């Protein structure tokens, strides 16, 4: 599992469940082509986005739908989404975990990168 996403809610102190996540990859013509998407599970994790074969080198964007998340909770948040953009696999395959910590007017994101 070369790409995983973990989302936490800093208001409730809990995993962020049913958060939509969309991954794009930058194409040769400099547009964003859809790559993979999914939703977080009860533990706030999203596995199985992609495979070692599909996850080639590239510039990737992970768009986490934080606005829908807050609105489902009856909250009016500031950000449209949390977008995380990075070059992947440039020095060979790595495993990437993208973590995001959500508040209504703030987010943080961290990358953990390991060598499989």
The residues that touch Ca ion, with contacts defined as CB under 5 A, are: 89-90
CA–CA separation, 7 vs 15, rounded Å?
6
Q: Compare residues 91 and 114 and give the one whose CB is closer to Ca ion.
A: 91
- CA angle 103–106–112, rounded 5-degree value: 90
Reference 37, options 56, 20, 59; nearest CA is 20
91 binds a copy of itself (CB under 8 A): no
Contact letters for a copy of itself, residues 12-41 (x by CB under 8 A) = xxxx--------------------------
Q: Compare residues 38 and 99 and give the one whose CB is closer to a copy of itself.
A: 99
Q: What single DSSP character describes residue 53?
A: T
Annotated binding-site residue numbers: 6, 45, 108
8 binds a copy of itself (CB under 8 A): yes
Total of chain residues touching a copy of itself, rule CB under 8 A: 32
CA–CA separation, 58 vs 72, rounded Å?
33
CA–CA separation, 29 vs 31, rounded Å?
6
Residue ranges in 42-61 that form contacts with a copy of itself under rule CB under 8 A: 59
């Amino acid at each position: 599992c070369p790409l995983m996403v973990k989302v936490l809610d800093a208001v409730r102190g809990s995993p962020a469940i049913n958060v939509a996540v969309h991954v794009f990859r930058k194409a040769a013509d400099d547009t964003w082509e859809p790559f993979a998407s999914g939703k977080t599970s009860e533990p706030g994790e999203l596995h199985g986005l992609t495979t070692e074969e599909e996850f080639v080198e590239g510039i990737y964007k992970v768009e986490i739908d934080t606005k829908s998340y807050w609105k489902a909770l009856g909250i009016s948040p500031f950000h449209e989404h949390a977008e995380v953009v990075f070059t992947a696999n440039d020095s060979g395959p790595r495993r990437y975990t993208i973590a995001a910590l959500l508040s209504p007017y703030s987010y943080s994101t961290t990358a953990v990168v390991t060598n499989p």
